[PDB]
Amino acid sequence: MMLYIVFILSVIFVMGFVGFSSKPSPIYGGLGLIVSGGVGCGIVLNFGGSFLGLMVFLIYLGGMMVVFGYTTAMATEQYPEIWLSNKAVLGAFVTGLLMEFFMVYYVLKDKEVEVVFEFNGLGDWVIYDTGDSGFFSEEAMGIAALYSYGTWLVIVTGWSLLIGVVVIMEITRG
Amino acid sequence: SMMKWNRERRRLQIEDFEARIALMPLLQAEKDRRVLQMLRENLEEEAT
Amino acid sequence: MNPIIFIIILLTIMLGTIIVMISSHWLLVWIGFEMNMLAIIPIMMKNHNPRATEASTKYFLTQSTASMLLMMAVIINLMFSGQWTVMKLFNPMASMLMTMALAMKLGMAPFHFWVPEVTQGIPLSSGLILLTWQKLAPMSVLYQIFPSINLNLILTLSVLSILIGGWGGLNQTQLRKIMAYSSIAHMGWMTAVLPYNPTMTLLNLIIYIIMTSTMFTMFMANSTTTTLSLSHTWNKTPIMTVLILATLLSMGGLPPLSGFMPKWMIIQEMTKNNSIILPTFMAITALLNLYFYMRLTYSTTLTMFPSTNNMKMKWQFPLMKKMTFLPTMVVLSTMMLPLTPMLSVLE
Amino acid sequence: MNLMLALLTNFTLATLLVIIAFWLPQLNVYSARLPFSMKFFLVAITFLLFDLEIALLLPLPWASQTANLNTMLTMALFLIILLAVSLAYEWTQKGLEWTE
Amino acid sequence: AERVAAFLKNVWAKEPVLVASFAIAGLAVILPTLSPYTKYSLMINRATPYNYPVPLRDDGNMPDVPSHPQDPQGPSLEWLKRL
Amino acid sequence: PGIVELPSLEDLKVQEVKVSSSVLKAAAHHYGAQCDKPNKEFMLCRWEEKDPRRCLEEGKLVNQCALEFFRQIKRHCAEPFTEYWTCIDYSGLQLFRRCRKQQAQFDECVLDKLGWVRPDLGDLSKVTKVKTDRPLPENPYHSRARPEPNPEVEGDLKPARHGSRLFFWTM
Amino acid sequence: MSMVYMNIMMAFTVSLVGLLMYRSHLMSSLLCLEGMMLSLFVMAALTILNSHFTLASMMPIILLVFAACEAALGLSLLVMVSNTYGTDYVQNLNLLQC
Amino acid sequence: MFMINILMLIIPILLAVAFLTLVERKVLGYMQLRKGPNVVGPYGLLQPIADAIKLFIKEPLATSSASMFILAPIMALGLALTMWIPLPMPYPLINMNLGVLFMLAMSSLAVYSILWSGWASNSKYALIGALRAVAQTISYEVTLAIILLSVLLMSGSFTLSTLITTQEQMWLILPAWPLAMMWFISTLAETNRAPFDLTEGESELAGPFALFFMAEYANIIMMNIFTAILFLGTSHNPHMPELYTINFTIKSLLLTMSFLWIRASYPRFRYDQLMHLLWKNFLPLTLALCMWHVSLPILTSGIPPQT
Ligand SMILES: CCCCCCCCCCCCO[C@@H]1O[C@H](CO)[C@@H](O[C@H]2O[C@H](CO)[C@@H](O)[C@H](O)[C@H]2O)[C@H](O)[C@H]1O
Ligand SMILES: CCCCCCCCCCCCO[C@@H]1O[C@H](CO)[C@@H](O[C@H]2O[C@H](CO)[C@@H](O)[C@H](O)[C@H]2O)[C@H](O)[C@H]1O
Ligand SMILES: CCCCCCCCCCCCO[C@@H]1O[C@H](CO)[C@@H](O[C@H]2O[C@H](CO)[C@@H](O)[C@H](O)[C@H]2O)[C@H](O)[C@H]1O
Ligand SMILES: N=C(N)NC(=N)NCCc1ccc(I)c(Cl)c1
């Protein structure tokens, strides 16, 4: 049911993580992280994080992960090894995949589960806020406040990005 | 030209926002009763 | 490196540390570590060689992993308390994750393996920053979260570091590795007393920094990175051998020298808390450090090792290295014991 | 639901067009480093760092609605100037050159 | 001054794109402080009512607080209408 | 922990204002001017009591004022008002600026037959003052007694007795 | 806790185990490091959004910006390693054994 | 009802792309003192159909990774169609509060199809050509995003239909023609169009081919539709929405035709020269104009409404 959409996305989130965490060829590992990034945006979108969700797409996927794939094609792998052809990768992938399914089966059967810690299984919708009738996006108001309240955050963040340029030029000059 | 139009758009936004402010007490009065009715209804079924 | 860039990068290393020390918000603490780590990599890499690249990469992976674990502890803390204030954490799992993250950053055993390798692979001046200034930011966080730290975890980390640091230094002929293992052992004393009296942690940290800076400066003045190279000092700068001897005996904790003071006060604070077995075990285990400090004094000052003919050419030129603050640092490293009550300024 | 339907339609159609594009009647019975160039790597990294600053500027249309306009304008310009300084540094350090 | 004008002519001839960039960037930094209209930006933003204006309990000592929206007391937006 | 007290289903019943949002939007400016007093009394109650159960009576008065407001439009200006809110209802954003002709006809009708004056730009966003016989709540947050502050320290700072007293040191 | 936190916490653990169990490519370990950031971004965003902590809405963006800058630094170290040995294999980074 | 609406967008987009190939050939031809297609159907009107059938029954002529060889064209075509769903013409298919950010986010993903097809080429030299194309594309993404932000400081929001309201009285090209100029050139470079068509240039110094071609030509139309909305706003009459659609279509056609006009008029940039055009010319001006457009609404008291 669509009432479990956030949970279903979170399940797909984990499988994508088991994908690249078992570490196939970095070409495929990069693909697994991209799928998890998109699914991670969807989870954030369903909690009212419209701007935050789109930043994952714009910055994490369209920026960072593009640079990761660019670097992989240039300095790591040019031709991917067949996926899961390695034994450890296949074993690690299968091991993680089975753990996720056993988690998902029990939480859905009992509507709760104790995997080390206690988790409710009624659906994430139950904790949502019941009153909202403002004429603005609260997420947008909070993010916009970076320029009024977060003067100090802007200074240190902007400085660190400038030092990022300086440092990387030093590192690579060799 | 952009300055003039945006100033008028700010006046039009204020008028729209003031219409919402006029209606907010009525909507708040309704939201309170709807929430309490639902809670009361959930309470009858719990007793059973 | 351009001299102006080197200054700006050094100031960024300091600024990142300062942000950690003045922040009340956990995000700013995390930012301070991120900024600090970004600025330190270029001074590890500055001599451009495979060893310096390996050290910078090993350092990056360790610190990045530790910062991810720190951000986890922060987010778990937010979930269970709804606030970001830098103070005691509000969840035992968060406390373990932050303690482990900060232990990794400090290079405490059993997260110590990177310290000898990274220090060996970078220049002396960069190792000086790594083993002194970089301890400030993590220790200042531990100073503020210690009420919520698991006592068994922190004391286990301390005991392991004193053992690993002591044993690891016995097998070393490289001066940078000797300093690395010496650093690991001294971190253990600092964290062992933290649950009882953080002031004594600060005292040990300050004195350790002073003696560590002295030794690195004296190594830099002569461009010595190995024991055998250091053994040629007597036939060039005899005064330097005496200063090295005095400083090493101080780092060994021998009275009447300054390095006795932190061990002396830590033992006092632990005994006031009916901790007797642990301080006694620590003091006896620190004899391992004294052994390989004494070994250096034998080959540097108390005996004259064989020389080389080309050394005579060195007799005709003076020391031109800055040796900044060395006369002050060596006097503080050795002659401060009579002023021990001054530790109350750190209260 | 509508956006999910639209996305599923677009990519489902794209899959189908690729399918028939690869399978139609034919009627016949019979990981090293890629000649690595450092300059192209620095373009990608420079794009990344500038992209992160753009992420910080995107809120600006909303920030202009604040009553704290004195602070907001000063920080907006400060961020853009620091972006310009980054470009100026790369420019003067030969980071935008394609020779050698 | 003459050395300043000679420098400006040189860059105008060789790097008009950079000259324009710096001139525009300089105007952006300077003109807000010289503009008589910058003060209205603060006032208009403050005059936009995003949330409900919660009324005050009348204690009998608030002659400056209107009792009805159409009473004369309180902020006026007549300056905004004429803008 | 105790029982959440809830009003009975009968105590919540009231006659509803069952008109759409374009109708409310069309009438909003005159509604704010006409029904200000019961509306502001209700909103004061809500923000002071912080409890919807404590303002049900004032909430019912809000409904009665609105119903009487719309009964007066129906009696006198039904046709001009219907044209106006139908114009508003067509727009996907329900824009005032698309309906100035029809708004003028409705505005002229209420002024002629009811004396109603549309409040000016900025009026309805004012903070006004309300006179209420309701007592001001004492502990709206239901706070417990706060813990007692630690015993303060007062006195004259004198030198430490015999100094640091650290082991053998005499100062 | 709510049901989503189970999987988001699991994803971080999976990527942490991935990071701590190296294979050969240094790039593969960098991806696990960025996976850890992704799960941190999602968990922080969910907590902040659900609790309506308005001013904290900017925090995931700051985390994203700084973590991307850290990843850029890591990628630069990877290419320098690759230039030295021709691969990003971590078994080559063993000179400081001695 | 909604699925009908989706198809009344997807199908016309593909048909418009098909006949843009004819218009391009005929416009280029007449600028070259010739005719272009005029035999295959009257005035060449069946030429796109003959080309389309021909390409799809051609032999579909080893990939270094089958999954990525197929992913790249699906990504390209799927993303290209997705960029259309928030466009207000005048009503969008999906009305997004952050539609401008969505288009920026989706367009940033399009570079993966270049990267993946370079990986799947199984050839060292094709991978290098793909990486050069990627570096060009991300370089011009920088100015496009900053130019867009500058314009939105006059509009007030990330909603695409608000650009219509912002230009009720006047086109945004008048206050922002310096940005319009760099925006227009940036779109050419972003779509690898002449004089920025370096992939086809540097390269020469069936169904799968057709699919990539459709994706690129759909992007070309879409970018010029975006340009029309961004800088040449058409007035919307809610009771006669078709009036908006006619005027806005004409502007988009003319902008698209000017892409062909430009291809016919200039030689090609060198790769290093188009990089300098961005990093040393456009980006400095874009940064300065971004500061200027942050200050201007504040100093004129012309800040737009949030909503
Ligand atoms: C490398 C670091 C670079 C940092 C660059 C920072 C540049 C900042 C330049 C402008 C900063 C101030 O810019 C502008 O100045 C005028 C001064 O009258 C302020 O004042 C103006 O607006 C305020 C509203 O807040 C009014 O009360 C005031 O009457 C009006 O004059 C503006 O509020 C401010 O927006
Ligand atoms: C090194 C592993 C790295 C991956 C980390 C993975 C994420 C870890 C998530 C930790 C969040 C759960 O944290 C845990 O939640 C439960 C839920 O009440 C808390 O509560 C639990 O212990 C306390 C004990 O007094 C009580 O609340 C109760 O007995 C029990 O429910 C725990 O005190 C807390 O430690
Ligand atoms: C857009 C919808 C279009 C609908 C059109 C439907 C028409 C279906 C009938 C298609 C007939 C295609 O005809 C056939 O195409 C294939 C394309 O590789 C050609 O090629 C094929 O045959 C040759 C030998 O003859 C083989 O070596 C080759 O490997 C094989 O591909 C044939 O030479 C041609 O005879
Ligand atoms: N570049 C041009 N304008 N001419 C040209 N030969 N284009 C390519 C021809 C083509 C490709 C795909 C399809 I579907 C169609 Cl219908 C036509």
Q: List the resolution, Å.
A: 2.3
What is the Cβ-side half-sphere exposure of residue C202, based on CA atoms within 13 angstroms? Answer: 13
Identify the residue whose C-alpha is closest to ligand 4 atom 5: H21
CA distance D70 to E32: 10
Which amino acid does the sequence have at A91?
A: G
Q: Does F164 touch chain C (CB under 8 A)?
A: yes
| CB distance C324 to C217 below 8 Å | yes
Separation between Cα atoms, residue D84 and residue D91, nearest integer Å: 10
Neighbours of C27 (CB within 10 A): 21
Of A131, A133, A106, A132, nearest to A121 by C-alpha is: A106
CA–chain centroid gap for G52, Å, is 27
What is the CATH architecture assignment of D7-92? Up-down Bundle (1.20)
Cβ <8 Å between H299 and E40:
no
Tokens 């970089």 appear where? Answer: C134
Helix (H, G, I), strand (E, B) or coil at C85: strand
For every residue of H18-87, DSSP letters joined together read HHHHHHHHHHHHHHTTS--S-TTTGGGTTHHHHHHHHHHTS-----S-HHHHHHHHHHHHHHHHHTTTT-
Residue G94 burial (CB < 10 Å; 0-12/13-18/19+)?
exposed
C-alpha distances out from residue E1 to E5, E7, E8, E27, Å: 6, 10, 11, 20
Counting other chains too, the contacts that C312-315 makes at CB distance below 8 Å and 24 or more residues apart are: C314/C236, C315/C236
Q: Are strands F129-130 and E56-57 parallel, antiparallel or unpaired?
A: parallel
Query: Is the Cβ of E45 closer than 8 Å to some Cβ of chain D?
Result: yes
CA distances C145 to A75, C87, C133, C198, Å, are 42, 5, 20, 11
Phi, psi of C87 (to 5 degrees): -175, -155
Discontinuities in chain G (C→N > 2.5 Å), after residue: none
Distance between CA atoms of H60 and D22, rounded to whole angstroms? 6
Task: Tell me which residue in H64, H68, H131 faces A74 most closely, judged by beta carbons.
Answer: H131
Q: Which of D67, D69, D77 sits opposite E29 (nearest CB)?
A: D77
CA dihedral over A121, A126, A129, A133, signed as positive or negative: positive
CB–CB of H62/H96 below 8 Å?
no
Contact E58 F130 (CB under 8 A): yes
Method: cryo-EM
Distances (CA, A) of H162 to F93, G47, H58, H293: 12, 32, 46, 18
CA dist., res. E28 & res. E26, Å (int) = 5
**HSE of H208, CA atoms in CB hemisphere, 13 A:** 14
Query: Is residue G98, in this structure, part of any structural domain at all?
Result: no
**Two structure tokens written together for C129:** 């920053």
Name every residue whose Cβ is closer than 8 Å to that of residue F97 and which is 6 or more positions away in sequence: B12
Q: How far apart are CA H91 and CA H244, in angstroms?
A: 10
- HEC readout, chain F: CCCCCCCCHHHHCCCCCCCCHHHHHHHHHHHHHHCHHHHHHHHHHHHHHCCHHHHHHHHHHHHHHHHHHHHHHHHHHHHHHHHHHHHHHHCCCCCHHHCHHHHHHHHHHHHHHHCCCCCCCCCCCCCCEECCCCCCCCCCCCCCCCCCCCCCCCCCCCCCCCCCCCCCCCC
For residue E56, the cross-strand partners are: F129
Residue listed under structure tokens 């078994």: G91
For residues H84 and H144, give the distance between their C-alpha atoms in angstroms, rounded to a whole number: 18
Instruction: Report yes or no on G61 lying in a domain.
Output: yes
> Residue holding tokens 């997420």?
A139
Q: Which residue in D has a C-alpha nearest to residue H289's C-alpha? A: D80
The count of C-alpha atoms lying within 13 angstroms of the C-alpha of H22, restricted to the half-sphere facing its C-beta, is 20
Cβ F70 vs Cβ F116: under 8 Å? no
Q: Where are the domains of chain D?
A: 7-92
Pair type for strands A112-115 and A117-120? antiparallel
Q: How far is the CA of H44 from the centre of ligand 3 (A)?
A: 25
Question: Taking a C-beta distance cutoff of 8 angstroms, is the pair F164, C344 a contact?
Answer: yes
H157-H160-H161-H166 Cα dihedral, nearest 10 degrees = 50
Tokens of H38: 């005029």
DSSP type of residue E57:
E
CA distance D73 to D68: 9
What is d(CA G17, CA G70) in angstroms, rounded to the nearest whole number?
Answer: 20
Residue ranges covered by each domain of chain A: 4-169
Angle ∠(D54,D57,D59) on CA atoms, nearest 5: 130
Q: Could you tell me which of C325, C46, C334 has the C-alpha nearest to residue C213?
A: C325
Residue B19 contacts F where some CB pair is shorter than 8 Å: yes
For the CA of H57, the nearest ligand: 3
Select from B3, B12, B16 the Cβ nearest to the Cβ of H302.
B3
What H or E segment, with its residue span, contains residue H181? Answer: helix H177-190
Best to test chain A binding among D5, D11, D34, D90 (most A CBs inside 10 Å): D34
Q: Is H44 in the pocket of ligand 4 (CB under 6 A)?
A: no
> What are φ and ψ of residue G89, in 5° steps?
-75, 130
Nearest CB among D7, D18, D65 relative to H306 is that of: D65
What H or E segment, with its residue span, contains residue C171? none
Whether G17 maps to a domain, the answer reads: yes
Ligand 3 binding residues, C-beta < 6 A: D 25-28; H 52-53, 56-59
Cα–Cα distance measured from residue D50 to residue D40, given in angstroms and rounded to the nearest whole number: 16
Q: Which of B19, E73, B17, E52 is nearest to F30 (CA)?
A: B19
Q: Which residue carries 């996907």 as its tokens? A: F92
CB neighbours of A28 closer than 8 A, spacing ≥ 6? A19, A20, A80, A83
Phi-psi region of C82 (alpha: psi -120 to 50; beta: other; left: phi over 0): left
CATH number of residue G81's parent domain: 1.10.287.3510
User: What letter does residue G89 receive in the DSSP assignment?
Assistant: B
Our CA-based measurement puts residue H91 at a distance from the nearest CA of chain F, in whole angstroms, of 10
Query: Phi/psi at F130 (nearest 5 deg)?
Result: -120, 140
CATH code of the region A4-169: 1.20.120.1200
The CA-based diameter of chain E, rounded to the nearest angstrom, is 73
Contact map slice: A 72-101 vs D, CB within 8 A: 73-79, 81
- Given a contact cutoff of 8 angstroms between Cβ atoms, the answer to whether C131 and C180 are in contact is yes
The rounded radius of gyration (Å) of the Cα atoms in chain H is 20
Q: What is the CA radius of gyration of chain F?
A: 29
DSSP, residue by residue, H204-268:
H--HHHHHHHHHHHHHHHHHHHHHHHHHSPPP--TT-HHHHHHHHHHHHHHHHHHHHHHHTT--P
Subunits in contact with chain B (3 or more CB pairs closer than 8 Å): A, E, F, H
Structural domain includes residue G93: no
Q: ∠ at Cα H127 (H126, H129), nearest 5°?
A: 65
Residue range of the domain that includes G11: 3-85
Residue of H88, H284, H114 whose CA lies nearest to H212:
H114
**Tokens encoding C34:** 């991120």
Residue F110 CA to residue F106 CA, distance in Å, equals: 6
Contact of chains D and G by CB distance (3 or more pairs under 8 angstroms): yes
* Residues D42, D36 contacting (CB under 8 angstroms): no
CA-based torsion, A71, A76, A80, A86: positive or negative: negative
Cα(C213)–Cα(C221) distance, integer angstroms: 12
